[PDB]
Design a protein around this motif. Structure first.
Motif, PDB file in Angstrom:
ATOM      1  N   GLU A  76      30.141  45.479  37.396  1.00  0.00           N
ATOM      2  CA  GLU A  76      31.344  45.140  37.955  1.00  0.00           C
ATOM      3  C   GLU A  76      32.527  45.688  37.211  1.00  0.00           C
ATOM      4  N   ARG A 238      40.045  41.488  38.843  1.00  0.00           N
ATOM      5  CA  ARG A 238      39.934  40.508  39.885  1.00  0.00           C
ATOM      6  C   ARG A 238      41.215  39.863  40.332  1.00  0.00           C
ATOM      7  N   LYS A 239      41.121  39.413  41.538  1.00  0.00           N
ATOM      8  CA  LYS A 239      42.126  38.641  42.234  1.00  0.00           C
ATOM      9  C   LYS A 239      42.517  37.362  41.620  1.00  0.00           C
ATOM     10  N   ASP A 240      41.609  36.724  41.031  1.00  0.00           N
ATOM     11  CA  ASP A 240      41.838  35.587  40.356  1.00  0.00           C
ATOM     12  C   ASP A 240      41.165  35.805  39.043  1.00  0.00           C
ATOM     13  N   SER A 243      38.725  33.124  37.510  1.00  0.00           N
ATOM     14  CA  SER A 243      37.296  33.040  37.678  1.00  0.00           C
ATOM     15  C   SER A 243      36.432  33.572  36.602  1.00  0.00           C
TER      16      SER A 243
END
Ligand SMILES: COc1cc(C(=O)O)cc(OC)c1OC
Length: 283
Positions: A76, A238-240, A243
């Motif tokens: 990732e 990431r978007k958040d 997380s």
């Protein structure tokens, strides 16, 4: 749950140990048969520390491909690292062969050649310009180009030569000098400053081969190094960023090498570095 909320509560409470142990209990158990062959006995510094067969780096040698080194591949996060033990007197030559075949740009060292009155690794690089080193077993030569000594780290420029073909390769040596003999650093700032310089030179970037990182055994100190970087990166990606869960990333990394991070203290350090780290890339 938010890192800092998590860390605030694990502290308050005293539970760092519990949490470390749970990570330990669920960590992956892959075979390590090659490391264990009898013929591979002087190529291993610690017996309780081996490289899984499935992720080990092979030397491009037709008679003994064995080296205590692992490829950690993070999908990732688009990052690859090689984690490896400190070189022993008979593996010095192998070490440098891997750097060459793997096409690495950098080498990250997180220990001192002698800590606690004992030897932790071999003096595997030349200390004066005119005093070069020769790896007869591997047909390589190693030359000191420049030294730049700092308070918390030292950076050295090194040149590798295929004796065979007269080919050369410029390597960058990043030596963190101040991890204490006992414990963990108080503050993370210096280690973080050391990461970014590592990043800044291109040594972790994709247009190069993978970076080689070691301490003594190649798993506690070395594990802190990449856990922190991967996570930081994921947070930007990431978007958040909320997380990203450090415990999960670690269990993942450990699918590739055993025992990444060796103590609860070491896990807590890991948190700090990440928390502070992020202060920077969210502002
Ligand atoms: C919380 O889960 C995820 C969130 C994000 C995001 O962009 O916030 C990205 C991920 O990786 C693809 C996740 O992993 C499953």
């Amino acid at each position: 749950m938010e890192m800092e909320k998590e860390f605030e509560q694990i502290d308050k409470s005293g539970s760092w140990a519990a949490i470390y142990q749970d990570i330990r209990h669920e960590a992956s158990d892959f075979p390590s048969r090659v490391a264990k062959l009898p013929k591979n006995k002087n190529r291993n510094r610690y017996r309780d520390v081996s490289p899984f067969d499935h992720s080990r780096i092979k030397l491009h040698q037709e008679d003994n491909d064995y080296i205590n080194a692992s490829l950690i591949k993070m999908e990732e996060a688009q990052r690859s690292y090689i984690l490896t033990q400190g070189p022993l007197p008979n593996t010095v030559g192998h070490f440098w062969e891997m750097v060459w075949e793997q096409k690495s740009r950098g080498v990250v060292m997180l220990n001192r050649v002698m800590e606690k009155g004992s030897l932790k690794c071999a003096q595997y690089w030349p200390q004066k310009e005119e005093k070069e080193m020769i790896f007869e077993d591997t047909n390589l030569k190693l030359t000191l180009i420049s030294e730049d000594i700092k308070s918390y780290y030292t950076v050295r420029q090194l040149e590798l030569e295929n004796l065979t073909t007269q080919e050369t390769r410029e390597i960058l040596h990043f030596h963190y000098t101040t991890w204490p003999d006992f414990g963990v650093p108080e503050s993370p700032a210096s280690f973080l400053n050391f990461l970014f310089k590592v990043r800044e030179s291109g040594s972790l970037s994709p247009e190069h081969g993978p970076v080689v990182v070691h301490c003594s055994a190649g798993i506690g100190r070395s594990g802190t190094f990449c856990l922190a970087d991967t996570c930081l990166l994921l947070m930007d990606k990431r978007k958040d960023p909320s997380s990203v869960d450090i415990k999960k990333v670690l269990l993942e990394m450990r699918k590739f090498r055993m025992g990444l991070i060796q103590t609860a203290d070491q896990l807590r350090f890991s948190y700090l570095a990440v928390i502070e780290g992020a202060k920077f890339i969210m502002g």
